[PDB]
């Protein structure tokens, strides 16, 4: 495993974060590849991509994703001003992250309909420190672990619905886990 933090590997920005609990290993591979293996983890997020992201990137991903418990596979990132944490969720484990959330619409992109939601994090950690901020979600109905994500279709649908993004910060294909187990191997481009 590599040390939690951010940096560049083989031309790609990467971010690997955990809550210090133990039970997760993250490795960077050739090109845009990264692997995650976890067993009775805490909360973590790891993946490769870009710093900063863009609002019209076409993100390609391929590989395997085998969660046992609560985990997501998504295009994941942030904006600043306004501060937003966002997800385009391609697959997940035992928990759909939109459970109980307010549905803000639908968008069709890259072979599936997605349901759109907005949630709020209250006094939680963020890229600028403790803050209250919104999260935007596109949750794919047809789950998969390879494909292409035309981010503009999501960001445009969000904007159409009143979900504004500020200036992009990082933008990665991320495996997230919350107190679960699993394995994943993903290549980004």
Curated annotation (Swiss-Prot):
Domain of life: Eukaryota
Organism: Hypocrea jecorina (strain ATCC 56765 / BCRC 32924 / NRRL 11460 / Rut C-30) (Trichoderma reesei)
Keywords: Carbohydrate metabolism, Glycoprotein, Glycosidase, Hydrolase, Polysaccharide degradation, Pyrrolidone carboxylic acid, Secreted, Signal, Xylan degradation
Domain spans labelled GH11: 1-188
Catalytic activity: Endohydrolysis of (1->4)-beta-D-xylosidic linkages in xylans
Record GO terms (molecular function): endo-1,4-beta-xylanase activity
One example of a Gene Ontology biological process annotation: xylan catabolic process
Family statement: Belongs to the glycosyl hydrolase 11 (cellulase G) family.
Main location: secreted
pH dependence: Optimum pH is 4.5-5.5. Stable from pH 3.0 to 8.5 at room temperature and from pH 4.0 to 7.5 at 40 degrees Celsius.
Parent-protein residues present: 35 to 223 of 223
Induction: Induced by D-xylose, dependent on the cellulase and xylanase regulator xyr1. Repressed by glucose through negative regulation by the crabon catabolite repressor cre1.
UniProt-annotated catalytic positions: 85 (nucleophile), 176 (proton donor)
Subcellular location: Secreted
Official protein name in the record: Endo-1,4-beta-xylanase 2
E.C. numbers: 3.2.1.8
Pathway: Glycan degradation; xylan degradation
Its job: Glycoside hydrolase involved in the hydrolysis of xylan, a major plant cell wall hemicellulose made up of 1,4-beta-linked D-xylopyranose residues. Catalyzes the endohydrolysis of the main-chain 1,4-beta-glycosidic bonds connecting the xylose subunits yielding various xylooligosaccharides and xylose. The catalysis proceeds by a double-displacement reaction mechanism with a putative covalent glycosyl-enzyme intermediate, with retention of the anomeric configuration. Produces xylobiose and xylose as the main degradation products.
Transmembrane segments: none
Listed GO CC annotations: extracellular region
The keyword Signal is assigned to this record: yes
């Amino acid at each position: 495993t590599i040390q939690p933090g951010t940096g560049y590997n083989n031309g790609y920005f990467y971010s690997y974060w955990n809550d210090g609990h133990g039970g997760v290993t993250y490795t960077n591979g050739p090109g845009g590849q990264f692997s995650v293996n976890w067993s009775n983890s805490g909360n973590f997020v790891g993946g490769k991509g870009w710093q900063p992201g863009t609002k019209n990137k076409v993100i390609n991903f391929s590989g395997s994703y085998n969660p046992n418990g609560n985990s997501y596979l998504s295009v994941y990132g942030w904006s600043r001003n306004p501060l937003i944490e966002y997800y385009i969720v391609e697959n997940f484990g035992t928990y759909n992250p939109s459970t109980g959330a307010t549905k803000l619409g639908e968008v069709t992109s890259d072979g599936s309909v997605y349901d759109i939601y907005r949630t709020q994090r209250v006094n939680q950690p963020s890229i600028i420190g403790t803050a209250t901020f919104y999260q935007y979600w596109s949750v794919r109905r047809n789950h998969r672990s390879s494909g292409s994500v035309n981010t503009a279709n999501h960001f445009n649908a969000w904007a159409q619905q009143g979900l504004t993004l500020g200036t992009m910060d990082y933008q990665i294909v991320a495996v997230e886990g919350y107190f679960s187990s699993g394995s994943a191997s993903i290549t980004v481009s």
